[PDB]
Design a binder for this molecule. Sequence first.
Ligand SMILES: [Zn+2]
Ligand SMILES: [Zn+2]
Lengths: 99, 1335
Amino acid sequence: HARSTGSYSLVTQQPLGGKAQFGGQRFGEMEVWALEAYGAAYTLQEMLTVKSDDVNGRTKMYKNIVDGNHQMEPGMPESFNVLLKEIRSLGINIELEDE
Amino acid sequence: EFDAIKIALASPDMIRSWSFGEVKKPETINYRTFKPERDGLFCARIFGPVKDYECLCGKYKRLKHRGVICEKCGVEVTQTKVRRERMGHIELASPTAHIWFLKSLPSRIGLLLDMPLRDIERVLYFESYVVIEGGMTNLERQQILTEEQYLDALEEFGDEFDAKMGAEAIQALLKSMDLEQECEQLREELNETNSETKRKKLTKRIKLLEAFVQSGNKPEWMILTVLPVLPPDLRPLVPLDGGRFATSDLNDLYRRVINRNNRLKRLLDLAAPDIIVRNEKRMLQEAVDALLDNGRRGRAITGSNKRPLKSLADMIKGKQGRFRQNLLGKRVDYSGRSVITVGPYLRLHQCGLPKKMALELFKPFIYGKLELRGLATTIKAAKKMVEREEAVVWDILDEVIREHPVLLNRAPTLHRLGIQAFEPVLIEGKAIQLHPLVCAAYNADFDGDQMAVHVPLTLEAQLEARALMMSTNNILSPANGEPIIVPSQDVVLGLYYMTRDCVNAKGEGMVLTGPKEAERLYRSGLASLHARVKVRITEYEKDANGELVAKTSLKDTTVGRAILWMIVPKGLPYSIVNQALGKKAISKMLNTCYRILGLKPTVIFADQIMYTGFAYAARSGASVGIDDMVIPEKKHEIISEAEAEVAEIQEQFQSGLVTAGERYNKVIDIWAAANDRVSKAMMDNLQTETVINRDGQEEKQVSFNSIYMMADSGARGSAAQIRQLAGMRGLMAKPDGSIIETPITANFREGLNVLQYFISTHGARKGLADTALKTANSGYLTRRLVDVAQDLVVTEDDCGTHEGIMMTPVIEGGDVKEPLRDRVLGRVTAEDVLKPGTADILVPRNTLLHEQWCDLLEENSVDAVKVRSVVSCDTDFGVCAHCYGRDLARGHIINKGEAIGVIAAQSIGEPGTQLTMRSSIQVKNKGSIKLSNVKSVVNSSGKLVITSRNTELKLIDEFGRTKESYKVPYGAVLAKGDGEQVAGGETVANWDPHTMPVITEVSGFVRFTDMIDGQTITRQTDELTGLSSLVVLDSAERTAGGKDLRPALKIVDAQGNDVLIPGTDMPAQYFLPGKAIVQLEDGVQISSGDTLARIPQGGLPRVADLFEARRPKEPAILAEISGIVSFGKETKGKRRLVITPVDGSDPYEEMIPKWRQLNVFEGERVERGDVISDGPEAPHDILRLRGVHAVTRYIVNEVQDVYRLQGVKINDKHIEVIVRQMLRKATIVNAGSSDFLEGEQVEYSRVKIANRELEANGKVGATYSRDLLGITKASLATESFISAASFQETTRVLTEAAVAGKRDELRGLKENVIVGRLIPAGTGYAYHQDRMRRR
DNA sequence: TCATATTATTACGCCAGACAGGG
DNA sequence: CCCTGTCTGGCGTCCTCTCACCTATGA
RNA sequence: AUGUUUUUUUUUUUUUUUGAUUUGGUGAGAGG
Ligand SMILES: [Zn+2]
Ligand SMILES: [Zn+2]
């Protein structure tokens, strides 16, 4: 099985799972620890922001690849803003501070 | 873009500021059409239009007026994702307190209003009343009231009196709670009391009272008044395949809260009576509490069928919340997965990758390449071209592959060598071809395994895959110094068959002018691959400074050793191939090649090793047959001699001469002896079976048996497995844990019958159950370790210290187990090591000890090295580059940046699978004696007896290093003395552990002081001997009239005056303990070394109990202060022990549980770190008593003992840094001139920078005290709540952070993996240097 | 079709952490 | 009042693949 | 040398760009 780009889920902006659903590989927790074990800071940054979740990042990246410019414009993951709204939907005021 | 994440409470004004409209109706959707509800949960005006830039109902179907809201639609006009960020709010009719601040253990409202949880819930569920500023009545403010208590009060205090209930009353209490006022009171209460329990109970209440005043969190924000609703997009309502909507659980929760709130508003309209609106508000309280955190209240609500439905807190917490399932691990585009296979033609920087996966993973690069050439125009055309797969896109694909690495990943990645980057080579096929040597890194066999491929998209990621994660760059395991590209199984058989010899072959003893014609004689058919031969080889030894000097000579060698010499690079000597080359020898061949010639010859030489091993293993034809497993001819007579022996033992058992346990022990002993004899018979019969003549009489050699080369080469097989295929397969054990007395005398070449196979299945089912349940604890151990580490990044170059732990070789009592060169390899010395002669600067004080320095250490026989350890590093927030050590997979020091906490945590937890889950001293060598911790005396006979319990007996050799060590008890008969030379095997120690010696220092006469027969001691004349002994009783058997009497022996002179201790003016009286029996009676003159009484008496969960720092059930008790010791009160729960120091203050004591067999007498002076009883010892006692270096030596030795018992090589840096992360918190003792509190627990780097910026001023600092937290308590007690929330319980940590108003200055690895940016360790450390500089 | 709103099983194994009881 | 059983909560491995099954009521 | 010398309705509207190809929990079983 292989996936470059196709459909994703509803709640989250990450790719679907499986083969019958044309989906990508779950880059799990211990693989993130293995990339932290190297100096792979940029590989991990595209591994969890551009390739997976951030919608503006992935559309800009697809257009940047097909122009011939391997460069990522990262932004913030969508599932973290989902986390902010689920935490904030309690009586909890979680924010994002100064520039 | 943004610094720290701030968490605080949500005010009702803040919740109305989040909101965009009140969600009234609970009606979800229409359900018969497609439209929602106006205005229900899924509204239009409150949130937004379903369709993008459209009024859902009807107006604006173009792009001109985005925003207009007509009365017929009551709809906003924006994007489809606008509803995902917009949230609604439910105006709760009746106030409802939060469940996270009422049941968090400890509750936030429980230790703030000074009221028990039980009483808080009673009033909260409309079952109890609470007073609130009554007035001039006889009632308190916190005191509650019941129906009867209120009824009577109602008729009594009908006027000025307030007694409400529920959240409303609670809210008022919190609202009317002067925070500041309580502070002073609490502070004054803590300074006006001495109660230990109260002190801790008051310090925990004042800590959460002053923390609330420090932030902008109000006391009335605990109760929920304006409940917030999560965005619809985040609670999606999609239908499955069919005609119904599979609705989420949160819609059930919100719809019930809104149904109940509408009912409660209508009842407060109608003025229903009291009990109706109490049940109505109570059902609303339980509905809100079920929405927020379901199931924390009594049994959780359920929709379909009996399974409870999932609430908001269950969208956060757990293995499947947002942290562990969508933020730490994500699903990933440009990724693939398939079954692996070998492909041995590869070079070790490249892997095979199928054409179909390659054309799917590289669709955008192919699109960009196709658009560059000009073959097509629009993007559609290119997608049709690769959907059709024409003849021109495969050249495009070979031009996008070429220099573009991919990340191969095996699915259980345990350490960092399980993600490696290759270059693709395209494969006709559907299976990833993976280079074989690399398999030993992935733990990848080829029995059905699968791997995932990931594509580095951007340019920095291609460079990170080539420069950090390439497979040529990972040739040493980061856990140690051992190479991980060791040749595994076929190739060592090909080498072991190639470089060997036989006593006659084709071309025996002919002479050859080079290795080239050695291979030419092997190929043409004129010699054999193993035929001993003088060749002329030219080995290049590089003895100058970087210059290779040729020396050519004639080596008496074989043909195969010359053929393998054609592949060895220049610098290695010929003697690396002159031996037989098993697996350990080829591993040290690649290791010496890496240490001498560097990286590139070692990569190309690893490939040439693998190619020539595969080729000559193919030419070998090394099969396995049924005749290869040679049965010993002596096996049947050994079994019959064992059968005669068990017959003799059972004939004694019929006549009852021997006991049953001694029978079972004798049967297990003779079957162990017969098993060892059968193994030696088959091992001789395999290791030297070949006996071939050469030009005359016969001559023997090691065998070319196939199973023996598979065992001796170390390819696959050991002694035990080849033992079970030929000799008997031992004594298998039943699942009771005890062994079975009748062994399995049949191997596998003979047939096992039925019972023997069933006993075998006992033994093997236990092993499969152990692995399949062991793997969960191994993985959870790696998780706890990488979440306690998680932060620690090499961030300096020198901390500027002179402290470091004292690396000695470790010695258990056998031969010296782990040499000093294994422990001080590549670790930077603390002070400069003196050469063992006299005062020489052998090595300087900041030199890395690589192999050349360690060889000059081994030549001089250096005792022990004071070396720098990670736990002694002075760097605030990180570890400096010298106190870590060598890079371990790079030859140099650790770079500024490389995350060492994560590689250390992986290197400790990765061998978690291989670990298991469930008289006197006899010297061995011949050397010199030395004693430490010794205070001794010469007895009458001459044997130096010892008056100290804790004496260490070292055996030092003639060179200076310490070769043996032992522990000698109090009062043992030493055959030798101090500084003496002995012989190998001579007994040097003797004692009796069943009889605790009460030996003396001086001589004289014996008097019975406080020894009265009848109450103190008893008369027990011996039965079978007649020589009686006055038996000393204990303090429990005698009655209360004489229980105060302490029996003792004090030595006098010939007159009767007390003979004093030499050095003091005190007599030497020995107080006899309980259960003693007097050996030497009254009037008998004594000497030293003679007793005065007879006193009769682990694998992987050990690693968990060392890092998590549990206490053992019966710890060894110690002394918190030095000085004289005494006893106390007679058995009220415990038996006291009072320690009065010589110069220090007296009042320390401890109540010992009296079930322990003590070690100390009444006239004994103790010390800190000195034992009082025996058994295991808790690490907190080591930390608060001996020192920090003592507890780090304790953990690294007690866990390298597990990792060495199971045989795993791990360097000690990793355990020292997880020990650093254990003892990172501290507690204050004297607050000093700072802003801390008395017994406040604060982290160590904070208090050290505080009193280091105050001590640089005039003010003297604060004196701390370090504390050792276990790894899950230490990773949950962090100054970064996302780090402590991605890990275990999120409810406790988020309420603690919310009511404290905590802020997360990100500054670690997992905060930046959550929030989606660069890691502040690796390549991103320059980015975080830049961002930290530009503030 | 369109609002009404929650009851008659037990059978893990530590391991911390808080709580009423009593010498 | 300091030990103490006793009770309550909170953990318990990653990755993947196949299949089936989904609230009752109701004038 | 010369041409108002057989006229009659045998009739004028495009594509337009502006947007995408759509699948959530529970429980059971297998591979490594
Ligand atoms: Zn409209
Ligand atoms: Zn340091």
